Amino acid sequence: SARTCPPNQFSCASGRCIPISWTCDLDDDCGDRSDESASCAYPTCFPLTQFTCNNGRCININWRCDNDNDCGDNSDEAGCSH
C-alpha cells in the first residue's frame, strides 16, 4: 500500500482508511482533525462524489434511499427509517 490507504483512498488520522471524497464531509466521517484540516477549504462540500444536505450540511453521496440522499431535515426524506 502506497503511504497507507490506497491511491483513490484517504487516510484520515493516517491509520483510518476511507475513500477520497469523504475527506471534506463535515464531521460525520472522521470529524475535523485531519480530514477537514488537510484539504477542506470548500464552499461546495466536495466535488468528488458527495451530496449537499439542504439543512446546510454536506453528506456522503451513498445515502440515497428513497430517491434522494439521507440527511434528516427536509431534503431527501429526512431519514429512511424502518
Cα–Cα distance, 62 to 66 (Å, whole number): 12
Whole-angstrom distance, CA of residue 59 vs CA of residue 26: 7
Cα separation, 9 vs 56, whole angstroms: 26
The count of structural domains within the chain is: 1
Q: Which helix (H) or strand (E) holds 10?
A: strand 9-11
Give Cα separations from 68 to 3, 17, 52, 64, 78 (angstroms).
35, 26, 11, 5, 10
Q: What's the domain range around 80?
A: 1-82
Q: Give Rg (Cα) of the chain.
A: 13
